[PDB]
Design a protein around this nucleic acid. Sequence first.
RNA 1: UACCGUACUGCAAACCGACUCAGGUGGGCUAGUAUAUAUACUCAGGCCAUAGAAUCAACCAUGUUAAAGGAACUCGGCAAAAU
Lengths: 50, 71, 195, 137, 177, 74
Amino acid sequence: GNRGNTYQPSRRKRVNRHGLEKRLSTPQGREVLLRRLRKGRWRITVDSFR
Amino acid sequence: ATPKKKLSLHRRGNRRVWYWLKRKTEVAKCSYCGALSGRNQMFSGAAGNSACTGQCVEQAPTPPASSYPAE
Amino acid sequence: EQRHLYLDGTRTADPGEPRYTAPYWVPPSARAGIPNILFSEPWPSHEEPQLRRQHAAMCLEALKRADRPLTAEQVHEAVNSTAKPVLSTLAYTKKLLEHLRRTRFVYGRKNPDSMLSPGHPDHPRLYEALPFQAARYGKPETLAAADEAARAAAIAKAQKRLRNGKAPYPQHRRRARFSIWQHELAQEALRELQA
Amino acid sequence: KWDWKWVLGKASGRKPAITRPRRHQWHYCNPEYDPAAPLPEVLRSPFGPPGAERSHDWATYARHLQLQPENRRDLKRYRARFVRFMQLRELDWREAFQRGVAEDSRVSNKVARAKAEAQRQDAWSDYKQAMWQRAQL
Amino acid sequence: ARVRVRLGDWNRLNRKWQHRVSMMKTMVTQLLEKERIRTTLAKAKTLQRYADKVITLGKQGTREAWSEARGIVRTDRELHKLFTQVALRYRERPGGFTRLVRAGWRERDAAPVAFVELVDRPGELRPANPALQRPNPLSVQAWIRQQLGQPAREPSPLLPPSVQQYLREENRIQQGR
Amino acid sequence: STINYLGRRRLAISRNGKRLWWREDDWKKAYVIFRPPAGQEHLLTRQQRPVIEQIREAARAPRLPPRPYPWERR
RNA sequence: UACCGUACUGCAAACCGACUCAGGUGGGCUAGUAUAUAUACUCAGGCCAUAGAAUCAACCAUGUUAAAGGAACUCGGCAAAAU
Ligand SMILES: [Mg+2]
Ligand SMILES: [Mg+2]
Ligand SMILES: [Mg+2]
Ligand SMILES: [Mg+2]
Ligand SMILES: [Mg+2]
Ligand SMILES: [Mg+2]
Ligand SMILES: [Mg+2]
Ligand SMILES: [Mg+2]
Ligand SMILES: [Mg+2]
Ligand SMILES: [Mg+2]
Ligand SMILES: [Mg+2]
Ligand SMILES: [Zn+2]
């Protein structure tokens, strides 16, 4: 068994885990977003776009 | 299977003697076009020689032959 | 018109044996200083396929006109005796008849008084010349018996496949074989016969 | 209506960045695409019959849905099977075209080789008879 | 690991033997289709030996020779050329139908390169030598070839006058059958 | 007929080498088929040859060469 | 009868493994000898670009053959051979 390939990509799972709405659904996710804002990150979440 | 110290400039030069190339003591020079090659090798236009003027071969007359061209 | 020497002389060349295309006869002690290509070319002459087709057709028509078991001797004599025009040797006639038998156009039977075990290739064979080219090679009664045995084996394998969890016969997806090429090929064929 | 060197793959086409069209895009990747021409009823590929356009395939769907009333159990599965049949039939037309063109080309080259050998032998015989004739003279 | 050069045998040319024979058959077919080809020295020497074998087989002119060359030689346009033009061209030559001229090294791998061509043709690079050299009957060689059992082996035209008196006859034509 | 396109990626290397990357604004491409206005319909403005001969000529045609490589000289 | 997808790749040099990585990656379609999607050769189709060039080193890996013997080898017939 060769390791190293733990990242199996999937857009549904990526948006459903680290998206905006699961971050906003819980209070501590909202303080995660708030300290992302206080640090000054250009990308707030993995699914943000314009 | 591993160097224990760093090789010095003198020791490195002594070890690198096998890497050097020997000079060639003969060259075949075409008087016209100034080309240079070995005496056993064709270096005219059929081989690589963009400077060839054909003066390297000074005589080539062969008009007569007879055969069946297969078509 | 299709008459050529053998290079041995005293015979004529069948399609499939070396000819002699030199215009004048020269003996081999004399021709010893000449390239061999200047007497016989070593390749087939590009007309032996067509002549072999014509000779086989004449052998079949001679076997067809006399509806009797007709061994190699009389089929050779029968093809020769219709106009040394054709079939210079018995070996060429035997080669044509065995090729016709291998393509299921004629068949073979035993020769009485010279049986020599009929599978031995030296055995003379009786040729019957069946009218249509058969789809199979053997006696039709034996082919029918083998087909009944194979059909019963097919039923047995299907029943054994039903006791196990499988279909009786293998089910395959139906395919499409028509295309633009076949439609246009049909149009070309219809115009070709139409002219 | 088609540019056949492009269809067989031996010429460049209109929109050369495609190189493998689906059922649609055959009409617009054709180098001989005429905008003024009317648009066909079904918009088929090449490799299929001339009657393959102007013929709706949903008559097959309704026909085998009507005479077999037990195909109405899973209707969505039935429709998926029908669409899969449509793509598979488009592939089988291509395969039949390729096999037909290959079987034509085999006998065409097989005839042309024998013609070339007949020409070569009839050219050699003239030279040989010329040599023996000049030996006569 | 078997010794091929140093113990006169065929070169290996970095290939398995079936690939090696197929490559030589392709190159001899190419050598007689275009009469001068250019390649590396090892293939050039192997091609020269194979060309001598194939050209002599074409010089026999027999049906078995045609059958053997039919598998050895691929083109069929050039099977005719080997049995007719090449056979008549070298009908009296005792081997050595090909010359080799070295042409330097090639750019992709610095391998030595040789030009291999058929001799005695219009477009060759050195004058050929005659295959035969008519002997003076008033010299030592002719008398050695009389006391010892040697043939005359003189230069000859394609059809000598020794067949002229047979071919002139109108009763030796058979009408063409 | 409408096609949605992404913007082109743009590279505009800086005073220190950074690889500044841009993206043009996304655009939609429309293919509009028009119709002749009134009475002017003549400006659609277009011998034979058999399609069997077309396919047979396009099957004996020489193949397209494989695409050369950007470092390859031909 | 609108909107979104439609290029290219997809057992892979374009995905997951730091790589042009011998690894991992789901479903479907298919011709003949022929008979099973196994096996040998082949159809349609595809490929012979990512180090090349010769040659007899020793030695290493993977195999073929071997006279007379035959587990006597070895911790142990392990490995090969054999059915
Ligand atoms: Mg595993
Ligand atoms: Mg990682
Ligand atoms: Mg070795
Ligand atoms: Mg082999
Ligand atoms: Mg759309
Ligand atoms: Mg794999
Ligand atoms: Mg790794
Ligand atoms: Mg890989
Ligand atoms: Mg194979
Ligand atoms: Mg390579
Ligand atoms: Mg023994
Ligand atoms: Zn010069």
